[PDB]
Design a protein around this ligand. Sequence first.
Ligand SMILES: Cc1cn([C@H]2C[C@H]3O[C@](c4ccc([N+](=O)[O-])cc4)(P(=O)(O)O)OC[C@H]3O2)c(=O)[nH]c1=O
Ligand SMILES: Cc1cn([C@H]2C[C@H]3O[C@](c4ccc([N+](=O)[O-])cc4)(P(=O)(O)O)OC[C@H]3O2)c(=O)[nH]c1=O
Ligand SMILES: [Mg+2]
Ligand SMILES: [Mg+2]
Lengths: 201, 201
Amino acid sequence: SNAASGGRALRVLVDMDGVLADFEGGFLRKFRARFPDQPFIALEDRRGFWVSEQYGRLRPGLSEKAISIWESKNFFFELEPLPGAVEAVKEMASLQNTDVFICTSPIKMFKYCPYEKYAWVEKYFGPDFLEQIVLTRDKTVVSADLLIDDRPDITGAEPTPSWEHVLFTACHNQHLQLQPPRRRLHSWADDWKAILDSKRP
Amino acid sequence: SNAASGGRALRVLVDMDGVLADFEGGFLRKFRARFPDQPFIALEDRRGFWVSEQYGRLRPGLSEKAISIWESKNFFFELEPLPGAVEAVKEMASLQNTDVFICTSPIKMFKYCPYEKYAWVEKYFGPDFLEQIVLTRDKTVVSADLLIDDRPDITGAEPTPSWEHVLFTACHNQHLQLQPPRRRLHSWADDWKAILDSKRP
Ligand SMILES: Cc1cn([C@H]2C[C@H]3O[C@](c4ccc([N+](=O)[O-])cc4)(P(=O)(O)O)OC[C@H]3O2)c(=O)[nH]c1=O
Ligand SMILES: Cc1cn([C@H]2C[C@H]3O[C@](c4ccc([N+](=O)[O-])cc4)(P(=O)(O)O)OC[C@H]3O2)c(=O)[nH]c1=O
Ligand SMILES: [Mg+2]
Ligand SMILES: [Mg+2]
């Protein structure tokens, strides 16, 4: 909930794909359904942020096939929420002196993805939560205390972002050793309130 | 153009409706075409940021009719650029040590508006400029040196935005007296480079 008059709430940016929405699992399911005669990458074996790059190494032309899954209509809309994600973000947004924004990057093909992200947020959080969406390819120009995001290296036009990036664990990043004092949120079952509280005055 | 390694470019946020895209003129044209037996507000007579509020005072039910224009498919996509806007922003983005983002708020009805804004940017600035779009209802959480925007009072979760708001003149705000030392950009013919240069190191 917002701070009082001209006051300062803790501001938390919550990533969408890989934090609220199960992009990796949705992708694998739809990939295997559309391309049942192609090899695929089990989630346990995922390495590196870019799915299409790993697929492109697995067999020639598979990068383009992988891309065609997330460029398809309904791919973003039909992603399942991560366990505990909707409940956690609902709770977080209800906390005193705490402003929550969903900060997400659309893919390059924009026919469906922006629309479907808004629709997904409306579905799981309600119409009033649409006010909290920030769509950007550059998260470094969004100011906050925290950014909870599964991408390991978040860069852009601002060399010194105001937020601390807490890495949200995903299949593609779970083995990564981070430079101290970078921190993780291992899942929504993990103690996200303690992370927030560490940044409060 | 971006700064060098970990370096700091001047960052300018450029609003879309009323700065790049002619929302007021597009609205009036389509309103009069769809509702030719209703009274309307000439641009010269526009007062206050919210078109639907002024229309709602003009005759009962006209607020809802006004809203139905911008909720229609193709309304955002078909807006004409303001004179000099595309040329100015192209030039600005080519300047050394200058990063330009288009920072725009979607309407509440999201079926068409986000998509059409991306499509409009692609049309006038090209595919590579899509990287520069930030869609948000709260501009105060986007950090920059300048925000060029026709809305007079830009507020949100950050009580002390990093940007200076330069008011871009529009029909609805042209008579407004601003509190010193608030500044205007009167049109894209006006000297926007001098405004940028005033914020450089
Ligand atoms: C969020 C996410 C997306 N992707 C896919 C989806 C698609 O996204 C992009 C992509 C690239 C850059 C950024 N960005 O730096 O903001 C977002 C998405 P696209 O190039 O926009 O299609 O990169 C290639 C593809 O990679 C992934 O492979 N893994 C992810 O975790
Ligand atoms: C940009 C702009 C939009 N409108 C219209 C369009 C529609 O926008 C909103 C609107 C409201 C708030 C914000 N915002 O504070 O980010 C954006 C758009 P909607 O409520 O989202 O439909 O307000 C009512 C309508 O008012 C205007 O009347 N004038 C404008 O300059
Ligand atoms: Mg992510
Ligand atoms: Mg505007």
